[PDB]
PDB file of N, CA and C in Angstrom:
ATOM      1  N   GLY A 797      -7.929 -13.594   4.225  1.00  0.00           N
ATOM      2  CA  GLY A 797      -8.859 -13.902   4.940  1.00  0.00           C
ATOM      3  C   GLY A 797      -9.394 -14.956   4.222  1.00  0.00           C
ATOM      4  N   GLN A 798     -10.699 -15.752   4.880  1.00  0.00           N
ATOM      5  CA  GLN A 798     -10.680 -17.346   4.525  1.00  0.00           C
ATOM      6  C   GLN A 798     -12.712 -17.014   4.307  1.00  0.00           C
ATOM      7  N   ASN A 799     -13.407 -17.919   3.354  1.00  0.00           N
ATOM      8  CA  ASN A 799     -14.606 -18.008   3.108  1.00  0.00           C
ATOM      9  C   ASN A 799     -14.639 -19.080   4.589  1.00  0.00           C
ATOM     10  N   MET A 800     -15.504 -18.977   5.288  1.00  0.00           N
ATOM     11  CA  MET A 800     -15.940 -19.716   6.448  1.00  0.00           C
ATOM     12  C   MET A 800     -17.681 -19.909   6.354  1.00  0.00           C
ATOM     13  N   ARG A 801     -18.475 -20.464   6.510  1.00  0.00           N
ATOM     14  CA  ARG A 801     -19.140 -21.065   6.887  1.00  0.00           C
ATOM     15  C   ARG A 801     -19.748 -21.059   7.942  1.00  0.00           C
ATOM     16  N   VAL A 802     -20.636 -19.213   8.141  1.00  0.00           N
ATOM     17  CA  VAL A 802     -21.483 -18.881   9.087  1.00  0.00           C
ATOM     18  C   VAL A 802     -23.093 -18.366   8.874  1.00  0.00           C
ATOM     19  N   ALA A 803     -23.261 -17.994   9.855  1.00  0.00           N
ATOM     20  CA  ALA A 803     -25.596 -18.470  10.524  1.00  0.00           C
ATOM     21  C   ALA A 803     -25.505 -17.401  11.553  1.00  0.00           C
ATOM     22  N   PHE A 804     -26.444 -17.338  11.146  1.00  0.00           N
ATOM     23  CA  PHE A 804     -26.915 -16.081  12.008  1.00  0.00           C
ATOM     24  C   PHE A 804     -28.171 -16.743  13.684  1.00  0.00           C
ATOM     25  N   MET A 805     -27.097 -17.384  14.644  1.00  0.00           N
ATOM     26  CA  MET A 805     -28.385 -17.395  15.131  1.00  0.00           C
ATOM     27  C   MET A 805     -27.950 -17.407  16.998  1.00  0.00           C
ATOM     28  N   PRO A 806     -28.703 -17.373  18.275  1.00  0.00           N
ATOM     29  CA  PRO A 806     -27.909 -17.947  18.689  1.00  0.00           C
ATOM     30  C   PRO A 806     -27.794 -18.805  19.674  1.00  0.00           C
ATOM     31  N   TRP A 807     -26.552 -19.080  20.065  1.00  0.00           N
ATOM     32  CA  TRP A 807     -25.849 -20.146  20.346  1.00  0.00           C
ATOM     33  C   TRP A 807     -25.493 -20.440  22.117  1.00  0.00           C
ATOM     34  N   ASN A 808     -26.412 -20.554  22.824  1.00  0.00           N
ATOM     35  CA  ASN A 808     -26.726 -20.960  24.180  1.00  0.00           C
ATOM     36  C   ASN A 808     -25.927 -20.309  24.764  1.00  0.00           C
ATOM     37  N   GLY A 809     -25.843 -18.462  24.012  1.00  0.00           N
ATOM     38  CA  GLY A 809     -25.245 -17.630  25.479  1.00  0.00           C
ATOM     39  C   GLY A 809     -23.310 -17.348  25.007  1.00  0.00           C
ATOM     40  N   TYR A 810     -23.144 -18.311  24.487  1.00  0.00           N
ATOM     41  CA  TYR A 810     -21.612 -18.343  23.897  1.00  0.00           C
ATOM     42  C   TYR A 810     -21.877 -17.505  22.703  1.00  0.00           C
ATOM     43  N   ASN A 811     -22.979 -16.257  22.193  1.00  0.00           N
ATOM     44  CA  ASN A 811     -22.079 -15.738  21.059  1.00  0.00           C
ATOM     45  C   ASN A 811     -23.153 -13.813  22.512  1.00  0.00           C
ATOM     46  N   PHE A 812     -22.694 -13.880  22.876  1.00  0.00           N
ATOM     47  CA  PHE A 812     -23.481 -13.418  24.007  1.00  0.00           C
ATOM     48  C   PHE A 812     -23.768 -11.840  23.556  1.00  0.00           C
ATOM     49  N   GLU A 813     -22.069 -10.509  23.270  1.00  0.00           N
ATOM     50  CA  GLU A 813     -22.077  -9.243  22.260  1.00  0.00           C
ATOM     51  C   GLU A 813     -21.716  -9.877  21.472  1.00  0.00           C
ATOM     52  N   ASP A 814     -20.416 -10.085  22.017  1.00  0.00           N
ATOM     53  CA  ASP A 814     -19.292  -9.967  19.987  1.00  0.00           C
ATOM     54  C   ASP A 814     -18.470 -10.884  20.470  1.00  0.00           C
ATOM     55  N   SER A 815     -18.828 -12.250  21.038  1.00  0.00           N
ATOM     56  CA  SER A 815     -17.810 -13.421  21.183  1.00  0.00           C
ATOM     57  C   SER A 815     -18.875 -14.409  19.860  1.00  0.00           C
ATOM     58  N   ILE A 816     -16.912 -15.179  19.569  1.00  0.00           N
ATOM     59  CA  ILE A 816     -17.568 -15.636  17.962  1.00  0.00           C
ATOM     60  C   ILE A 816     -17.753 -16.737  18.408  1.00  0.00           C
ATOM     61  N   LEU A 817     -18.109 -17.906  18.050  1.00  0.00           N
ATOM     62  CA  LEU A 817     -17.764 -19.315  18.036  1.00  0.00           C
ATOM     63  C   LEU A 817     -17.490 -20.495  16.852  1.00  0.00           C
ATOM     64  N   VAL A 818     -16.081 -20.869  17.171  1.00  0.00           N
ATOM     65  CA  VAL A 818     -15.323 -21.088  15.634  1.00  0.00           C
ATOM     66  C   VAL A 818     -15.637 -23.455  16.065  1.00  0.00           C
ATOM     67  N   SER A 819     -16.085 -23.723  15.358  1.00  0.00           N
ATOM     68  CA  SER A 819     -16.048 -25.293  14.850  1.00  0.00           C
ATOM     69  C   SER A 819     -14.724 -25.965  15.059  1.00  0.00           C
ATOM     70  N   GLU A 820     -14.686 -26.775  15.822  1.00  0.00           N
ATOM     71  CA  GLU A 820     -13.232 -28.170  15.815  1.00  0.00           C
ATOM     72  C   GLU A 820     -12.885 -27.810  13.797  1.00  0.00           C
ATOM     73  N   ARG A 821     -13.698 -28.451  13.175  1.00  0.00           N
ATOM     74  CA  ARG A 821     -13.102 -27.921  11.627  1.00  0.00           C
ATOM     75  C   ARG A 821     -12.640 -26.811  11.175  1.00  0.00           C
ATOM     76  N   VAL A 822     -12.832 -26.043  11.828  1.00  0.00           N
ATOM     77  CA  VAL A 822     -11.570 -25.164  11.346  1.00  0.00           C
ATOM     78  C   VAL A 822     -10.689 -25.341  12.025  1.00  0.00           C
ATOM     79  N   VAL A 823     -10.338 -25.615  12.849  1.00  0.00           N
ATOM     80  CA  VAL A 823      -9.206 -25.565  13.900  1.00  0.00           C
ATOM     81  C   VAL A 823      -8.500 -26.545  13.345  1.00  0.00           C
ATOM     82  N   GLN A 824      -8.902 -28.130  13.079  1.00  0.00           N
ATOM     83  CA  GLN A 824      -8.033 -29.214  12.367  1.00  0.00           C
ATOM     84  C   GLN A 824      -7.411 -28.764  10.901  1.00  0.00           C
ATOM     85  N   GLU A 825      -9.068 -28.056  10.540  1.00  0.00           N
ATOM     86  CA  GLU A 825      -8.057 -27.685   8.405  1.00  0.00           C
ATOM     87  C   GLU A 825      -7.116 -27.080   8.542  1.00  0.00           C
ATOM     88  N   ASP A 826      -6.357 -26.525  10.254  1.00  0.00           N
ATOM     89  CA  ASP A 826      -5.338 -24.725  10.403  1.00  0.00           C
ATOM     90  C   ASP A 826      -5.327 -24.551   9.235  1.00  0.00           C
ATOM     91  N   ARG A 827      -7.091 -23.711   9.673  1.00  0.00           N
ATOM     92  CA  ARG A 827      -7.310 -22.332   8.712  1.00  0.00           C
ATOM     93  C   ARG A 827      -7.161 -21.666   9.942  1.00  0.00           C
ATOM     94  N   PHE A 828      -6.401 -20.279   9.302  1.00  0.00           N
ATOM     95  CA  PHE A 828      -6.435 -19.138  10.049  1.00  0.00           C
ATOM     96  C   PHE A 828      -4.690 -18.906  10.962  1.00  0.00           C
ATOM     97  N   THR A 829      -4.183 -20.347  10.842  1.00  0.00           N
ATOM     98  CA  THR A 829      -2.518 -20.546  11.234  1.00  0.00           C
ATOM     99  C   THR A 829      -2.025 -19.093  11.066  1.00  0.00           C
ATOM    100  N   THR A 830      -0.957 -19.045  12.197  1.00  0.00           N
ATOM    101  CA  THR A 830      -0.639 -17.632  12.211  1.00  0.00           C
ATOM    102  C   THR A 830       0.919 -18.315  12.305  1.00  0.00           C
ATOM    103  N   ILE A 831       1.993 -17.814  10.951  1.00  0.00           N
ATOM    104  CA  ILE A 831       3.160 -17.321  11.509  1.00  0.00           C
ATOM    105  C   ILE A 831       4.123 -16.672  11.591  1.00  0.00           C
ATOM    106  N   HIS A 832       5.008 -16.534  13.100  1.00  0.00           N
ATOM    107  CA  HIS A 832       5.782 -15.938  13.229  1.00  0.00           C
ATOM    108  C   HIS A 832       7.109 -15.201  13.163  1.00  0.00           C
ATOM    109  N   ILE A 833       7.682 -14.340  13.287  1.00  0.00           N
ATOM    110  CA  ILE A 833       9.546 -15.131  12.806  1.00  0.00           C
ATOM    111  C   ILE A 833      10.116 -13.832  13.854  1.00  0.00           C
ATOM    112  N   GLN A 834      10.582 -14.844  14.958  1.00  0.00           N
ATOM    113  CA  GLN A 834      11.673 -14.108  15.841  1.00  0.00           C
ATOM    114  C   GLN A 834      13.050 -13.790  15.384  1.00  0.00           C
ATOM    115  N   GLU A 835      13.967 -12.586  16.302  1.00  0.00           N
ATOM    116  CA  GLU A 835      14.823 -12.303  15.805  1.00  0.00           C
ATOM    117  C   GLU A 835      15.638 -11.774  17.289  1.00  0.00           C
ATOM    118  N   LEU A 836      17.047 -12.702  17.679  1.00  0.00           N
ATOM    119  CA  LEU A 836      17.593 -11.928  18.796  1.00  0.00           C
ATOM    120  C   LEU A 836      19.139 -11.849  18.065  1.00  0.00           C
ATOM    121  N   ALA A 837      19.464 -11.304  18.921  1.00  0.00           N
ATOM    122  CA  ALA A 837      21.201 -10.772  18.194  1.00  0.00           C
ATOM    123  C   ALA A 837      22.388 -10.326  20.071  1.00  0.00           C
ATOM    124  N   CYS A 838      23.403 -10.375  19.821  1.00  0.00           N
ATOM    125  CA  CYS A 838      24.224 -10.302  20.813  1.00  0.00           C
ATOM    126  C   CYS A 838      25.932  -9.996  19.826  1.00  0.00           C
ATOM    127  N   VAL A 839      26.318  -9.306  20.930  1.00  0.00           N
ATOM    128  CA  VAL A 839      27.636  -8.800  20.797  1.00  0.00           C
ATOM    129  C   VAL A 839      28.735  -9.274  22.070  1.00  0.00           C
ATOM    130  N   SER A 840      29.576  -8.514  21.158  1.00  0.00           N
ATOM    131  CA  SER A 840      31.092  -9.559  21.556  1.00  0.00           C
ATOM    132  C   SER A 840      31.263  -7.994  22.381  1.00  0.00           C
ATOM    133  N   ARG A 841      31.486  -6.779  22.332  1.00  0.00           N
ATOM    134  CA  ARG A 841      31.827  -5.869  23.343  1.00  0.00           C
ATOM    135  C   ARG A 841      33.685  -5.764  24.231  1.00  0.00           C
ATOM    136  N   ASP A 842      34.278  -5.968  23.386  1.00  0.00           N
ATOM    137  CA  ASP A 842      35.774  -5.799  23.787  1.00  0.00           C
ATOM    138  C   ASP A 842      36.287  -4.904  24.882  1.00  0.00           C
ATOM    139  N   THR A 843      36.372  -5.656  25.676  1.00  0.00           N
ATOM    140  CA  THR A 843      36.688  -4.835  27.285  1.00  0.00           C
ATOM    141  C   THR A 843      38.551  -4.860  27.431  1.00  0.00           C
ATOM    142  N   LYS A 844      38.735  -4.268  28.827  1.00  0.00           N
ATOM    143  CA  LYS A 844      39.748  -3.587  29.545  1.00  0.00           C
ATOM    144  C   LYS A 844      40.376  -5.034  29.375  1.00  0.00           C
ATOM    145  N   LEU A 845      39.342  -5.695  30.430  1.00  0.00           N
ATOM    146  CA  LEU A 845      40.750  -7.420  30.608  1.00  0.00           C
ATOM    147  C   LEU A 845      41.142  -8.593  29.199  1.00  0.00           C
TER     148      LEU A 845
ATOM    149  N   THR B 266      27.106 -12.800  36.373  1.00  0.00           N
ATOM    150  CA  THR B 266      27.415 -12.329  35.871  1.00  0.00           C
ATOM    151  C   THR B 266      27.569 -11.094  34.702  1.00  0.00           C
ATOM    152  N   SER B 267      26.512 -10.331  34.678  1.00  0.00           N
ATOM    153  CA  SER B 267      26.412  -9.188  33.756  1.00  0.00           C
ATOM    154  C   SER B 267      27.237  -7.857  33.708  1.00  0.00           C
ATOM    155  N   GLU B 268      28.332  -8.273  33.603  1.00  0.00           N
ATOM    156  CA  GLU B 268      29.850  -7.607  33.533  1.00  0.00           C
ATOM    157  C   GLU B 268      29.737  -6.577  32.567  1.00  0.00           C
ATOM    158  N   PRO B 269      30.109  -5.113  33.029  1.00  0.00           N
ATOM    159  CA  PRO B 269      30.560  -3.819  31.831  1.00  0.00           C
ATOM    160  C   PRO B 269      31.234  -4.440  30.759  1.00  0.00           C
ATOM    161  N   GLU B 270      31.176  -3.514  29.641  1.00  0.00           N
ATOM    162  CA  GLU B 270      32.267  -3.041  28.815  1.00  0.00           C
ATOM    163  C   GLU B 270      33.026  -1.180  28.938  1.00  0.00           C
ATOM    164  N   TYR B 271      34.874  -1.522  29.205  1.00  0.00           N
ATOM    165  CA  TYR B 271      35.397  -0.051  30.258  1.00  0.00           C
ATOM    166  C   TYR B 271      37.129   0.072  29.195  1.00  0.00           C
ATOM    167  N   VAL B 272      36.807   0.523  28.180  1.00  0.00           N
ATOM    168  CA  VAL B 272      38.137   0.973  28.408  1.00  0.00           C
ATOM    169  C   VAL B 272      38.150   2.470  27.482  1.00  0.00           C
ATOM    170  N   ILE B 273      38.835   3.321  26.968  1.00  0.00           N
ATOM    171  CA  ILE B 273      38.648   4.204  25.989  1.00  0.00           C
ATOM    172  C   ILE B 273      40.203   4.239  25.528  1.00  0.00           C
ATOM    173  N   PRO B 274      40.596   4.942  24.403  1.00  0.00           N
ATOM    174  CA  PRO B 274      41.247   4.749  23.130  1.00  0.00           C
ATOM    175  C   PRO B 274      41.553   5.582  23.083  1.00  0.00           C
ATOM    176  N   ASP B 275      43.167   5.881  22.951  1.00  0.00           N
ATOM    177  CA  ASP B 275      43.258   7.262  22.770  1.00  0.00           C
ATOM    178  C   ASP B 275      43.819   7.490  21.188  1.00  0.00           C
ATOM    179  N   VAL B 276      44.093   7.242  20.327  1.00  0.00           N
ATOM    180  CA  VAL B 276      44.498   7.111  19.142  1.00  0.00           C
ATOM    181  C   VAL B 276      43.939   6.415  18.898  1.00  0.00           C
ATOM    182  N   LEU B 277      43.532   6.570  17.542  1.00  0.00           N
ATOM    183  CA  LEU B 277      43.229   5.020  16.620  1.00  0.00           C
ATOM    184  C   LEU B 277      43.315   4.137  15.086  1.00  0.00           C
ATOM    185  N   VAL B 278      43.952   3.263  14.893  1.00  0.00           N
ATOM    186  CA  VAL B 278      44.297   3.305  13.614  1.00  0.00           C
ATOM    187  C   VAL B 278      43.727   2.082  13.048  1.00  0.00           C
ATOM    188  N   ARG B 279      43.069   2.276  11.472  1.00  0.00           N
ATOM    189  CA  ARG B 279      41.965   1.634  10.876  1.00  0.00           C
ATOM    190  C   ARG B 279      42.620   0.512   9.964  1.00  0.00           C
ATOM    191  N   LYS B 280      43.533   0.245   9.003  1.00  0.00           N
ATOM    192  CA  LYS B 280      43.001  -0.123   7.487  1.00  0.00           C
ATOM    193  C   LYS B 280      42.467   0.536   6.796  1.00  0.00           C
ATOM    194  N   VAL B 281      43.115   2.177   6.343  1.00  0.00           N
ATOM    195  CA  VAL B 281      41.895   2.597   5.241  1.00  0.00           C
ATOM    196  C   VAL B 281      43.095   2.075   3.485  1.00  0.00           C
ATOM    197  N   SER B 282      42.771   1.226   2.965  1.00  0.00           N
ATOM    198  CA  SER B 282      43.826   0.054   1.691  1.00  0.00           C
ATOM    199  C   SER B 282      44.625  -0.345   1.764  1.00  0.00           C
ATOM    200  N   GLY B 283      45.220  -0.606   3.357  1.00  0.00           N
ATOM    201  CA  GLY B 283      47.517  -0.476   3.105  1.00  0.00           C
ATOM    202  C   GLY B 283      47.370   1.138   3.855  1.00  0.00           C
ATOM    203  N   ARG B 284      48.413   0.842   4.410  1.00  0.00           N
ATOM    204  CA  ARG B 284      49.064   2.304   4.261  1.00  0.00           C
ATOM    205  C   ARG B 284      48.121   2.669   5.377  1.00  0.00           C
ATOM    206  N   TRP B 285      47.729   1.802   6.614  1.00  0.00           N
ATOM    207  CA  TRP B 285      46.718   2.345   7.481  1.00  0.00           C
ATOM    208  C   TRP B 285      47.102   3.588   8.697  1.00  0.00           C
ATOM    209  N   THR B 286      46.238   4.444   8.873  1.00  0.00           N
ATOM    210  CA  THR B 286      46.254   6.105   9.239  1.00  0.00           C
ATOM    211  C   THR B 286      45.727   6.051  10.320  1.00  0.00           C
ATOM    212  N   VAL B 287      46.799   6.435  10.944  1.00  0.00           N
ATOM    213  CA  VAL B 287      46.656   7.455  12.628  1.00  0.00           C
ATOM    214  C   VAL B 287      46.119   8.333  12.914  1.00  0.00           C
ATOM    215  N   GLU B 288      44.548   8.437  13.513  1.00  0.00           N
ATOM    216  CA  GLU B 288      44.540   9.498  13.509  1.00  0.00           C
ATOM    217  C   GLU B 288      43.814   9.637  15.298  1.00  0.00           C
ATOM    218  N   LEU B 289      43.912  11.146  15.773  1.00  0.00           N
ATOM    219  CA  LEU B 289      43.716  11.365  17.488  1.00  0.00           C
ATOM    220  C   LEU B 289      42.531  10.743  17.905  1.00  0.00           C
ATOM    221  N   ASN B 290      42.233  10.336  19.195  1.00  0.00           N
ATOM    222  CA  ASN B 290      40.354  10.121  19.667  1.00  0.00           C
ATOM    223  C   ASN B 290      40.109  11.642  19.570  1.00  0.00           C
ATOM    224  N   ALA B 291      39.030  12.305  18.979  1.00  0.00           N
ATOM    225  CA  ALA B 291      38.858  13.411  19.094  1.00  0.00           C
ATOM    226  C   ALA B 291      38.023  13.988  20.323  1.00  0.00           C
ATOM    227  N   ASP B 292      36.879  13.153  20.618  1.00  0.00           N
ATOM    228  CA  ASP B 292      36.356  13.272  21.874  1.00  0.00           C
ATOM    229  C   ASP B 292      36.403  13.322  23.178  1.00  0.00           C
ATOM    230  N   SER B 293      38.229  12.116  23.135  1.00  0.00           N
ATOM    231  CA  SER B 293      38.818  12.113  24.074  1.00  0.00           C
ATOM    232  C   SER B 293      39.832  13.574  24.668  1.00  0.00           C
ATOM    233  N   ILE B 294      40.356  13.823  22.942  1.00  0.00           N
ATOM    234  CA  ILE B 294      41.040  15.335  23.467  1.00  0.00           C
ATOM    235  C   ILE B 294      40.634  16.445  23.636  1.00  0.00           C
ATOM    236  N   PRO B 295      41.552  16.760  25.062  1.00  0.00           N
ATOM    237  CA  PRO B 295      41.558  18.513  25.999  1.00  0.00           C
ATOM    238  C   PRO B 295      41.637  19.679  25.223  1.00  0.00           C
ATOM    239  N   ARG B 296      41.194  20.403  25.397  1.00  0.00           N
ATOM    240  CA  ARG B 296      40.482  21.811  24.541  1.00  0.00           C
ATOM    241  C   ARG B 296      40.654  22.949  25.531  1.00  0.00           C
ATOM    242  N   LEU B 297      41.147  23.692  25.380  1.00  0.00           N
ATOM    243  CA  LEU B 297      41.217  24.906  26.183  1.00  0.00           C
ATOM    244  C   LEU B 297      40.368  26.306  25.228  1.00  0.00           C
ATOM    245  N   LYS B 298      40.714  27.524  25.177  1.00  0.00           N
ATOM    246  CA  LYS B 298      39.663  27.997  24.677  1.00  0.00           C
ATOM    247  C   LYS B 298      39.575  29.782  25.034  1.00  0.00           C
ATOM    248  N   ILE B 299      40.386  30.897  24.215  1.00  0.00           N
ATOM    249  CA  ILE B 299      39.949  31.836  24.799  1.00  0.00           C
ATOM    250  C   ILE B 299      38.822  32.743  25.499  1.00  0.00           C
ATOM    251  N   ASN B 300      38.294  32.905  26.559  1.00  0.00           N
ATOM    252  CA  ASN B 300      37.828  33.708  26.335  1.00  0.00           C
ATOM    253  C   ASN B 300      37.799  35.331  26.255  1.00  0.00           C
ATOM    254  N   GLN B 301      36.496  35.278  25.079  1.00  0.00           N
ATOM    255  CA  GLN B 301      36.850  36.927  24.451  1.00  0.00           C
ATOM    256  C   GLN B 301      36.281  37.751  25.427  1.00  0.00           C
ATOM    257  N   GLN B 302      35.548  37.352  26.223  1.00  0.00           N
ATOM    258  CA  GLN B 302      34.879  38.887  26.950  1.00  0.00           C
ATOM    259  C   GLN B 302      35.919  39.589  28.045  1.00  0.00           C
ATOM    260  N   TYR B 303      36.601  38.364  28.470  1.00  0.00           N
ATOM    261  CA  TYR B 303      37.576  38.816  29.818  1.00  0.00           C
ATOM    262  C   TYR B 303      39.141  39.425  28.497  1.00  0.00           C
ATOM    263  N   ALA B 304      39.102  39.228  27.677  1.00  0.00           N
ATOM    264  CA  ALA B 304      40.073  39.670  26.358  1.00  0.00           C
ATOM    265  C   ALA B 304      39.766  40.881  26.244  1.00  0.00           C
ATOM    266  N   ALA B 305      38.711  41.982  25.580  1.00  0.00           N
ATOM    267  CA  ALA B 305      38.166  42.728  25.475  1.00  0.00           C
ATOM    268  C   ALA B 305      38.153  44.175  26.693  1.00  0.00           C
ATOM    269  N   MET B 306      38.152  42.838  27.995  1.00  0.00           N
ATOM    270  CA  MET B 306      38.373  44.162  29.717  1.00  0.00           C
ATOM    271  C   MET B 306      39.750  44.671  29.507  1.00  0.00           C
ATOM    272  N   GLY B 307      40.548  44.220  29.077  1.00  0.00           N
ATOM    273  CA  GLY B 307      42.432  44.577  29.401  1.00  0.00           C
ATOM    274  C   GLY B 307      42.388  45.534  29.496  1.00  0.00           C
ATOM    275  N   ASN B 308      42.460  46.346  27.891  1.00  0.00           N
ATOM    276  CA  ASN B 308      42.826  47.569  27.093  1.00  0.00           C
ATOM    277  C   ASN B 308      42.006  48.484  28.289  1.00  0.00           C
ATOM    278  N   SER B 309      40.877  48.640  27.788  1.00  0.00           N
ATOM    279  CA  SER B 309      39.545  49.644  28.131  1.00  0.00           C
ATOM    280  C   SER B 309      39.284  50.250  29.827  1.00  0.00           C
ATOM    281  N   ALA B 310      40.230  49.050  30.665  1.00  0.00           N
ATOM    282  CA  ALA B 310      40.581  48.623  31.936  1.00  0.00           C
ATOM    283  C   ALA B 310      41.241  49.853  32.598  1.00  0.00           C
ATOM    284  N   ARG B 311      39.705  50.948  32.980  1.00  0.00           N
ATOM    285  CA  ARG B 311      40.828  52.182  33.563  1.00  0.00           C
ATOM    286  C   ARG B 311      41.253  52.260  34.957  1.00  0.00           C
ATOM    287  N   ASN B 312      41.764  50.784  35.420  1.00  0.00           N
ATOM    288  CA  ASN B 312      43.139  50.888  36.686  1.00  0.00           C
ATOM    289  C   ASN B 312      44.691  50.093  36.066  1.00  0.00           C
ATOM    290  N   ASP B 313      45.488  49.774  36.900  1.00  0.00           N
ATOM    291  CA  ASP B 313      46.452  50.009  36.978  1.00  0.00           C
ATOM    292  C   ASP B 313      46.327  47.820  37.501  1.00  0.00           C
ATOM    293  N   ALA B 314      45.559  47.882  38.816  1.00  0.00           N
ATOM    294  CA  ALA B 314      45.747  46.611  38.860  1.00  0.00           C
ATOM    295  C   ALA B 314      44.441  45.377  38.053  1.00  0.00           C
ATOM    296  N   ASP B 315      43.388  45.935  37.695  1.00  0.00           N
ATOM    297  CA  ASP B 315      42.665  44.878  37.108  1.00  0.00           C
ATOM    298  C   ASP B 315      43.654  45.623  35.580  1.00  0.00           C
ATOM    299  N   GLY B 316      43.946  45.670  35.002  1.00  0.00           N
ATOM    300  CA  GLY B 316      44.432  46.040  33.493  1.00  0.00           C
ATOM    301  C   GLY B 316      45.637  44.848  33.815  1.00  0.00           C
ATOM    302  N   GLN B 317      46.520  44.795  35.078  1.00  0.00           N
ATOM    303  CA  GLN B 317      47.672  44.102  34.517  1.00  0.00           C
ATOM    304  C   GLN B 317      47.189  42.662  35.255  1.00  0.00           C
ATOM    305  N   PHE B 318      45.640  42.730  35.918  1.00  0.00           N
ATOM    306  CA  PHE B 318      45.008  41.414  36.841  1.00  0.00           C
ATOM    307  C   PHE B 318      45.367  40.705  34.775  1.00  0.00           C
TER     308      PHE B 318
END
């Protein structure tokens, strides 16, 4: 995780019940960016023909 | 484009250290096994029809 600067105050209902308001600085700083790896596989399956 | 895989090998032969050795296909090979019930019901049989049969 990251030590994000937070505050406790409603902001135009964007934090109505359980919604979080993230500034653009966090997006720009590449924070919480995730990497995922996908695997594909194929076989030959020799047939009669 | 979706075309299947389909061929059943009878025998198998496969490079164990040189001198590669043939073994037959176990799954493929047919096999008959004597029924025991009916084997133990020929003697004690009381009729000639049955016994002979």
